[PDB]
């Protein structure tokens, strides 16, 4: 009836990770503004390392005349847009590294498991830093849009506008992902509950490392469209690889680059890895004939 007892708490995870999570403000001029900065959109960001590199969502910082980063300790910075990637909806920011910067705990050896308790940390509706608790509902989710699918952690940790670009962490404080999107599909007009997505941390890292190295993310481009044995070529793919190879639409591609092609997704990934300008074999079955065409890859067209 009296308590020397200890309340179940995730405060430790909070104390470890929260300081590294920042408030990102996208400020823009308005014809209305008449020379006065106004907040277009706002969200969150994660301080990845002490050099002052910050991860956030691209849609948070799009078309910004100024980007402001606010730390929980009071410090305010103006940030440099290192680069962004529409495909992953990621963007990297840079800030003054003098003194000390808090960093988000990362553990590359950690395997996120379905059912893991996670906290979402961000700045919903600009109320200030909010911590919500949920679990990992799923992994490898395509998201709301089937096409151009990307791996997503799904979580029922409450996510609202302002949470974008913020962190998802486990009870140990380790970064699990970057909260990006929530599901709103009408489906009879009701409101979807407890369904939000995060870019997995491993992907976040790789993309950040590529945006710091180059102003953008560099991928190989074949310029074809098709749906999932073998794969069918539907897209016109005009110019570039399609012209260089003179590919014929309506054909099925058995294998490419000393590797099998059962699923287009595993294939599309492979295509992106390869450097731009390289030429490799493509195996298609046209009229039940094993035809082979040489083709030059090129850097993925900017979005």
């Amino acid at each position: 009836d009296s308590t020397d007892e200890t309340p179940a708490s995730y405060n430790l995870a909070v104390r470890r990770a929260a300081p590294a999570v920042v408030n990102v403000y996208n400020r823009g001029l308005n014809t209305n503004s008449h020379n006065q900065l106004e907040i277009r959109t706002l969200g969150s960001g994660v301080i990845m390392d002490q050099r002052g590199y910050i991860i956030t969502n691209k849609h948070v910082i799009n078309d910004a005349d100024q980007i402001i980063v606010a730390l929980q300790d009071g410090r305010v910075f103006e940030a440099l847009l290192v680069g962004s990637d529409s495909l992953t909806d990621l963007a990297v920011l840079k800030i003054n590294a003098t003194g000390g910067l808090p960093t988000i705990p990362i553990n590359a050896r950690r395997v996120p498991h379905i059912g893991d308790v996670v906290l979402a940390i961000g700045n919903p509706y600009n109320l200030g830093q909010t911590i919500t608790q949920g679990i990992i509902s799923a992994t490898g989710r395509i998201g709301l849009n089937p096409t151009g699918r990307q791996n997503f952690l799904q979580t029922d940790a409450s996510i609202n506008p302002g949470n974008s670009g913020g962190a998802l962490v486990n009870s140990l404080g380790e970064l699990m992902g970057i909260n990006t999107l929530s599901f709103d599909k009408s489906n009879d007009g009701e409101t979807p509950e407890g369904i939000g997505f995060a870019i997995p941390f491993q992907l976040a890292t790789k993309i950040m490392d590529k945006l710091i190295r180059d102003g953008r993310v560099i991928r190989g481009y074949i310029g074809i469209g098709g749906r999932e044995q073998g794969i069918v070529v539907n897209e016109v793919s005009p110019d570039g690889p399609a012209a260089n190879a003179g590919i014929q639409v309506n054909d099925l591609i058995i294998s490419v680059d000393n590797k099998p092609a059962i699923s287009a997704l595993e294939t599309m990934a492979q295509v992106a890895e390869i450097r731009p300008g390289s030429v490799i074999p493509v195996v298609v079955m046209r009229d039940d004939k094993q035809l082979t065409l040489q083709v030059t890859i090129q850097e993925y067209p900017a979005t």
Binding site: P146, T147, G148, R149, Y221, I222, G223, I224, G225, G226, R227, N234, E235, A264, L265, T267, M268, V271, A272
Partner: peptide
Amino acid sequence: VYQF
């Protein structure tokens, strides 16, 4: 449906 998938373009790459």
